[PDB]
Every structure is written in structure tokens, then in C-alpha cells.
């Protein structure tokens, strides 16, 4: 086993961390912030295997370190490691019960119906740009990427829009490695009190949206506790806004660095669905997914994940496995045709909202470059920088000069 790798909480060099984990694969020793030792799978072939192995589980009571009360309650990463009972944290027969009404609501068919809505919100956001003074840089993150998927997923769950500025300011702190440990459990307090408030707004006045579809259904021949709903709602609002925002940003960043490919994208030669997929492989929004545990020793290539130890899937590292995609695994090629990446997961927990975000991004990007065909970065590509979020590949801002609307 190669030298232990300590995930930098300031994300000063993601591309090199990823390469190191690549080198230390298939299974690498890793240290999470606060000195917590866990292992990490960093190869494509082997990550598929562990994700479909029933010996690898989400029950934290299987974690040696947690049995032995070694994980501070004040830990910054506790939010991710132990978020409570939901689809995310259980397995096998118990899992299917919490997933099913959510997996049905986000199929290609049942999400096609939201398109009208997404075109609406995009075509608006575009109006608000250009409404800004031309010539002067704009943060494409704050003005376009952030609000769009939030609005969407708010609509989907029927969340009141007057809680947006408050939800923004809370998720900011949840993800930051530089949020002060004494501040943790009044942030989590207020998330809980925020989500409980709007769940009761829904019981009082049930709408057609998915929050209410969970409420009515539980009462008859299937499951769903008062807590399981509340936890399953946080999961859907968090996962479904964070990741997709980053996808959009990252697509825009990729086309900037690769302008020959951008030229062909804008002309139609390369279809947009190939750019979005390649961006997911090459520069996934989710660098690391937290937390599984071996029920017993598992062979992993020529190493062993010892029974009781934590496991991380390093999607960022494995997104450029040359064993999987050949010698060009390190480069953005939007035409890379057979492209069976796992940015969305594998086995039982694989993303149920893949089709939603593929849809949001496949509407919003071509809309933006139809309106602003000259749009390029306002800063050199190397000055762009990751926010301090160890699991996520999030940029701080994306300043661009729009360059006059040919819409």
C-alpha cells in the first residue's frame, strides 16, 4: 500500500490529488479531514465491483472507528457520513421500499413533462443577463448556473421560493471544510427546522408536486415514516441542486479550455449530449462519495479492504482510468463515443435523477450559447479555483464576458 493521501480541505490541486489516487490504486489509503483514516477505490473496473458487492454496506454501525466512538460528534464531515435514515443509507430489501416512489417520478418519461418549465426558467435567466451592463464581467455561477437547478428542484418538491436566500446561506456552510466546528449543530438545527416547516406547509395544503406524492402513499399499503419523508426530502433538494450546478459550470469551463471542440459544438457537428457526458467523465461534479463499510475482508485487485474500515469512491480519480477509456483518458474529447462512465454511481444506489440533470443541462447550455455565441472566460483558465469542499468539484466563481446577444 502506497503512502497515505490526505485530502486537502482547500482543494488547491484536485487534478494532482486525482492523479495520485490513480497511482495508488486500485485501493488507496486515505485520510479525511480531522485525521480520520479510510480507504478509497480509484480504478474503474474495481469500483464497479465494490459498488455491486453485498459485503460493502452503508450501515455505519459496521464502521470499526464508529463502534469505538472515535468519530467526533462535532466532525465537519458528519453531515455526509451520518445524515439519518433515507434511501441513501440503507440496503437490499429495505432500500427498494424508500427508493421506489422517487425512482418512478424521475424516469425519462415522467421528467419530459418538466421541459416546458425548464425552458421557461432558462429563457427568463437569459433575459436577466443582457439586462446587466455589457462589457463588464459577470459571474456565470451566481447569475445563471446557481439559481436554475435550484428553482427546478424547488418546483419538483413544491418548496416555497421565499426560503431560497436562506437555503443558499445554509448549504454554503454545510459543505465548507472551513466552517467552524462549534457552528455545525445550529446550521444542522436550522436545516431540520427549515425542512420540517415546509413539510407541514404540504400536509396542510397538498399540491401535485413530489413532496405531497410521498405523504399520500405512505398511509396505504407501503411504508414511509414522518422522518423517512423528511430525510428523503433533504437528500433530493441537496443532491439535485449542488451537483447539476457544477456540471453546468464545468461544461462551460471545458469548452473554454478546448475552443476547437467548442467551435464544432456551437455549429452542431458535435451534438450537445456528448459534451455533457464527457464533462461528467473527465471532470465530474462529485470528486468523492462518502461512505461504505466492509462487512468482511474484501480482496481488491492485489490488496485487501479490511473488515470494518471505511470506503470512499473517488469518482474524480477514476473518471480518467486509462484501463477503461484508453490512452486518451486524460483529455476532454466530446466525441468519445463508447463512454460508459460511472459519474452517476453503480449498483443499487445509482442516481435516480440522472435523466433530470441530463435534461436541465441539455436545455440550459445550448440556450446560453444560442443567445451569447461569443461567451468566453473573463480570466485566464488557470486562475479559476475550487471552493474548499473536499467531496465536491465546485468552482468559486465563473467570470465571463458574454459578448453581445445574437438571439
Ligand X SMILES: C[C@]12CC[C@H]3[C@@H](CCC4=CC(=O)CC[C@@]43C)[C@@H]1CC[C@@H]2O
Which of ligand HEM, ligand X, none lies near 236, with the C-beta cut-off 5 to 8 A by kind?
A: ligand HEM
Minimum Å gap between C-beta 236 and ligand HEM is 5
292 annotated to bind ligand: yes
Would you state the cell numbers that stand for residue 250, as one nine-digit string? 464545468
- Contacts of 199 by beta carbon, 8 Å cutoff, 6+ apart: 211, 229, 230, 233
Q: 369, 268 in Cβ contact below 8 A?
A: no
| Residue 87 binds which of ligand X, ligand HEM, none (CB < 5-8 A, kind-dependent) | ligand HEM
Least separation in angstroms between residue 393's CB and ligand HEM is 10
Residue 125 or residue 243: which is nearer to ligand X going by CB?
Answer: 243
Q: Minimum distance between the CB of residue 153 and ligand HEM, rounded to whole angstroms?
A: 6
Nearer to ligand X, 36 or 404 (CB): 36
Q: Candidates 22-30, 123-131, 278-286, 325-333: pick the segment binding ligand HEM (CB under 6 A).
A: 278-286
Residues counted in the chain: 407
> What number of CA atoms fall less than 13 Å from residue 263's CA on the CB side?
3
- The site partner of 247 among ligand HEM, ligand X, none (C-beta below 5 to 8 Å per kind) is ligand HEM
Helix axes 354-371, 226-257, angle to 10 degrees: 40
3-state secondary structure of 382: helix
Least gap, CB of 251 to ligand HEM (angstroms): 10
Based on the shown chain and the rule CB under 6 A, indicate whether residue 255 belongs to the binding site for ligand HEM. Answer: no
- The rounded distance, in Å, linking the Cα atoms of 344 and 156 is 20
Neighbours of 50 (CB within 10 A): 21
Helix (H) or strand (E) holding 250: helix 226-257
Interface segment toward ligand HEM; rule CB under 6 A; list 185-193, 236-244, 297-305, 333-341:
236-244
Of the candidates 117, 137, 345, 366, which one interacts with ligand HEM according to CB under 6 A?
A: 345
In 315-353, where does DSSP find H-type helix? 315-318, 322-325
C-alpha cell at 30: 486515505
Q: Which is nearer to ligand X, 178 or 328 (CB)?
A: 178
Q: Look at residue 139 and give its three-state secondary structure.
A: strand
- Contact of 60 with 293, CB cutoff 8 Å: yes
Residue among 49 and 356 whose Cβ is closer to ligand HEM? 356
Binding positions for heme b: 58, 95, 99, 292, 349, 351
Which chain residues interact with ligand HEM by CB under 6 A? Answer: 87-88, 99, 106, 153, 235-236, 239-240, 243-244, 247, 284-286, 289, 343-345, 349, 351-353, 356-357
Amino acid at each position: 500500500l502506497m503512502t497515505r493521501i490526505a485530502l486537502d480541505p482547500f482543494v488547491r490541486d484536485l487534478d494532482g490529488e486525482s492523479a495520485a489516487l490513480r497511482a495508488a490504486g486500485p485501493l488507496a489509503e486515505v485520510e479525511l479531514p480531522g485525521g480520520v483514516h479510510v480507504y478509497a477505490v480509484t480504478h474503474h473496473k474495481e469500483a464497479r465491483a465494490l459498488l455491486t458487492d453485498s459485503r460493502v454496506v452503508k450501515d455505519i454501525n459496521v464502521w470499526n472507528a464508529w463502534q469505538r466512538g472515535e468519530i467526533p460528534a462535532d466532525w465537519p464531515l458528519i453531515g455526509l457520513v451520518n445524515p439519518g435514515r433515507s434511501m441513501l443509507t440503507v440496503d437490499g430489501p429495505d432500500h427498494r421500499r424508500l427508493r421506489t416512489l422517487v425512482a418512478q417520478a424521475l424516469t425519462v418519461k415522467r421528467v419530459e413533462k418538466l421541459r416546458a418549465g425548464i425552458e421557461a426558467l432558462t429563457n427568463a435567466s437569459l433575459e436577466r443577463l443582457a439586462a446587466l451592463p455589457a462589457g463588464e464581467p459577470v459571474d456565470l455561477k451566481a447569475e445563471f448556473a446557481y439559481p436554475l437547478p435550484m428553482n427546478v428542484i424547488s418546483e419538483l418538491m413544491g418548496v416555497d421560493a421565499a426560503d431560497h436566500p436562506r437555503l443558499k446561506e445554509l448549504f454554503e456552510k454545510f459543505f465548507s471544510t472551513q466552517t467552524p466546528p462549534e457552528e455545525v449543530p445550529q446550521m444542522m438545527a436550522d436545516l431540520g427546522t427549515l425542512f420540517t416547516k415546509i413539510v407541514e406547509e404540504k400536509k396542510a395544503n397538498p399540491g401535485d408536486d413530489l413532496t405531497s406524492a410521498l405523504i399520500a402513499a405512505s398511509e396505504d399499503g407501503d411504508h414511509l415514516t414522518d422522518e423517512e419523508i423528511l430525510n428523503t426530502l433533504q437528500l433530493i433538494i441537496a443532491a439535485g441542486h449542488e451537483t447539476t450546478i457544477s456540471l453546468i459550470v464545468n461544461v462551460v469551463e471545458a469548452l473554454a479550455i478546448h475552443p476547437e471542440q467548442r467551435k464544432k459544438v456551437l455549429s452542431g457537428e458535435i451534438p450537445w449530449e456528448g459534451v455533457i457526458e464527457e464533462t461528467l467523465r473527465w471532470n465530474t461534479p462529485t470528486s468523492h462519495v462518502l461512505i461504505r463499510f466492509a462487512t468482511e475482508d474484501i480482496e481488491v485487485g492485489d490488496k485487501v479492504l479490511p473488515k470494518g474500515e471505511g470506503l470512499v469512491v473517488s469518482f474524480g480519480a477514476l473518471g480518467r482510468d486509462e484501463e477503461q477509456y484508453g490512452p486518451t483518458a486524460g483529455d476532454f474529447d466530446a466525441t468519445r463515443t463508447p463512454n460508459r462512465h460511472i459519474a452517476f454511481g453503480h449498483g443499487p444506489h445509482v442516481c435516480p435523477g440522472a435523466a433530470l440533470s441530463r435534461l436541465e443541462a441539455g436545455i440550459a447550455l445550448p440556450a446560453l450559447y444560442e443567445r451569447f455565441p461569443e461567451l468566453d472566460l473573463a480570466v485566464p483558465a488557470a486562475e479559476l479555483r475550487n471552493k474548499p469542499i473536499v467531496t465536491q468539484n465546485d468552482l468559486h466563481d465563473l467570470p465571463v464576458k458574454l459578448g453581445c446577444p445574437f438571439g
